[PDB]
Design a protein around this ligand. Structure first.
Ligand code: HEM
Ligand SMILES: O=C(NC[C@](O)(Cn1cncn1)c1ccc(F)cc1F)c1ccc(-c2ccc(OC(F)(F)F)cc2)cc1
Ligand SMILES: CCCCCCCCCCCCO[C@@H]1O[C@H](CO)[C@@H](O[C@H]2O[C@H](CO)[C@@H](O)[C@H](O)[C@H]2O)[C@H](O)[C@H]1O
Length: 527
């Protein structure tokens, strides 16, 4: 039994390792994890209680590069080889993807005990929004925060928002250097300049109120830019680095939330709390069901998060709407005729109810969100082992699950000719979304119990979006006015750009320029 002499040579070998020249040591510090990673994958591949794991060369990094550049093309290749459930390594994390409607069910309807959104997202959002809200709090708090925000998102609220949003659009056409319709009949714009600007102007005026919109006409607007630059997927890896980008971000968060808090405290002092905006609403309705009240700081931080999330999804979407219509004068013409019919040649004022009578306009939004889901991947951290039904698979705690309704939006099996933009695929189905059957309430209102729809621009289950009707209201007013006021087209040789999958939303790669011209060159915008 010469295991003793073998154990002596183990200790001897461990000693001889340290006497290697330093280059051989570093070389061994690199070659040994690499070889072990390959060996580990080969062994892992033997497992039958695990989904197939995408092979990768660089330890820790995994498939990060190819996933980040072209996630849908990555998914399609993986789907061909391995089917609908497969894992990949992403910067030290194991991501289990479940494609298609069954994956929507597996992730969006997973048990609260099994998965955690806030554990996946906290580092992404908390340094931008501030503490105590959205993902920096337990799920039950998030549920009620969504309930609070929904209280300012009623039909009656949208009826008041429409003329406010319309006013802001017309003001932008009049005053922005990108347009100046009283002085120019044609111009060239970068839609990733105009649309983020129009989106924050319209959303601040309606959700935040006249005071906070007024602020955007000052140097305070630079704080919003500074905060917007902090809203980036780099926060997943580097939420805080001692650089200037980060300190500009933190400073802006303090100053913007400070501005909101100043208005909040001034309103309470003056007893000036009406039903004007989301701030009024949160001042009157922000008590959790255990009787704890949101602080003024948490109210402000929630306002930041709502406005920032709504900012990126909606600005990206109206950019894509403009870009797809720039090569589709037929759609512009069809939309214009609908406007003339619904609004009696323009003699009728746009109202929230009339927006509902504009199916083609709404189908255009719907179809843009099919082809351009602003969020290509949604994440949950796995908290308890999950059995994948009808498989032998178990997804262990410490893994992440990734769901991608945006991938299914682009599958021919569910949307024939899925890479053609065609608003008429939605004829007699112009609703922003539809609960086909039974409903459930997680704390913010009854929503569809099933999430099997191949079309889920707004997600589903407890984390489902509550801004869908605001987004359609905002996008609808904005596009109604764009269509009635302008025609637009591409400069020669340009077409729809491909998306940027490394940004917070799948926005178009730039510079994405269109040329506009006034339908009525003599139309003037008053005020
Ligand atoms: C076209 C516009 C929009 C799209 C496509 C969209 C999409 C989504 C999606 C897919 C989710 C689910 C996220 C997940 O499961 O991880 C979500 C959540 C949410 N969205 Fe939106 N959104 C849009 C606009 C807005 C707007 C305008 C607001 C606010 C006014 C908003 C506020 C929220 C909130 C509060 C949540 C809940 C997050 C959670 O429960 O974890 N969204 N949105
Ligand atoms: O903002 C994100 N998720 C919060 C969000 O739901 C966004 N949102 C939804 N509705 C409106 N905004 C949210 C909810 C409530 C709020 F109040 C504020 C919010 F903001 C998100 C952003 C980027 C990625 C992402 C993932 C992978 C990726 O690819 C990679 F890794 F870079 F390669 C790129 C981006 C995922 C989620
Ligand atoms: C015969 C004539 C008389 C018939 C009666 C007609 C009643 C008309 C009143 C309709 C009610 C709408 O009036 C009021 O609108 C505001 C929006 O401005 C809604 O307000 C809602 O949105 C605002 C703004 O986001 C939030 O601040 C607020 O917390 C929320 O409740 C009120 O909830 C609603 O009560």
């Amino acid at each position: 039994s010469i295991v003793g002499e073998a154990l002596e040579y183990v200790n001897i070998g461990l000693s001889h390792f340290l006497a290697l020249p330093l280059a051989q040591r570093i070389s061994l510090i690199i070659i040994i994890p690499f070889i072990y990673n390959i060996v580990w994958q080969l062994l892992y591949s033997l497992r039958k209680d695990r989904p197939p794991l995408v092979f990768y060369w660089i330890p820790w990094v995994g498939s990060a590069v190819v996933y980040g550049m072209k996630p849908y093309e990555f998914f399609e290749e993986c789907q061909k080889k391995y089917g609908d459930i497969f894992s990949f390594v992403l910067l030290g994390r194991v991501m289990t993807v479940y494609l298609g409607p069954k994956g929507h069910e597996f992730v969006f309807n997973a048990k609260l005990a099994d998965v955690s959104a806030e554990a996946a997202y906290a580092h992404l959002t908390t340094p931008v929004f501030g503490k105590g809200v959205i993902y920096d709090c337990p799920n039950s708090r998030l549920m009620e925060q969504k309930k609070f925000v929904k209280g300012a998102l009623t039909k009656e609220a949208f009826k008041s928002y429409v003329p406010l949003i319309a006013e802001e659009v017309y003001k932008y056409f009049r005053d922005s250097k990108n347009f100046r319709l009283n002085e120019r009949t044609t111009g060239t714009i970068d839609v990733m300049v105009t649309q983020p600007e129009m989106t924050i102007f319209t959303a601040s005026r309606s959700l935040l109120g006249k005071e906070m919109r007024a602020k955007l006409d000052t140097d305070f607007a630079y704080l919003y830019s500074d905060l917007d630059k902090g809203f980036t997927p780099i926060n997943f890896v580097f939420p805080n680095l001692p650089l200037e980008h980060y300190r500009k971000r933190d400073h802006a968060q303090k100053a913007i939330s400070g501005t909101y808090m100043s208005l909040i405290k001034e309103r309470r002092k003056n007893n000036d709390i009406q039903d004007r905006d989301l701030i009024d609403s949160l001042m009157k309705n922000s008590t959790y069901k255990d009787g704890v009240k949101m602080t003024d700081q948490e109210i402000a931080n929630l306002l930041i998060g709502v406005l920032m999330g709504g900012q990126h999804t909606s600005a990206a979407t109206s950019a894509w709407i403009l870009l797809h219509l720039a090569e589709r004068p037929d759609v512009q013409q069809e939309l214009y005729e609908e406007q003339m019919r619904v609004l009696d040649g323009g003699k009728k004022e746009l109202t929230y109810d009339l927006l509902q009578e504009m199916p083609l306009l709404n189908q255009t939004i719907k179809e843009t969100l099919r082809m351009h889901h602003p969020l290509h991947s949604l994440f949950r951290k796995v908290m308890k082992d999950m059995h994948v039904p009808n498989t032998s698979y178990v997804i262990p705690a410490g893994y992440h699950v990734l769901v991608s309704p945006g991938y299914t939006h682009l599958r021919d099996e569910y949307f024939p000719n899925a890479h053609q933009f065609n608003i008429h695929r939605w004829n007699n189905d112009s609703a922003s979304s539809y609960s086909v059957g039974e409903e459930v309430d997680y704390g913010f209102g009854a929503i569809s119990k099933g999430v099997s729809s191949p079309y889920l621009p707004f997600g589903g289950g407890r984390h489902r979006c509550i801004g869908e009707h605001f987004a359609y209201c905002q996008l609808g007013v904005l596009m109604s006015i764009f269509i009635r006021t302008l025609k637009w087209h591409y400069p020669e040789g340009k077409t729809v750009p491909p998306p940027d999958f490394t940004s917070m939303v799948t926005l178009p790669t730039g510079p994405a320029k269109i040329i506009w011209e006034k339908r009525n060159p003599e139309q003037k915008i008053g005020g």
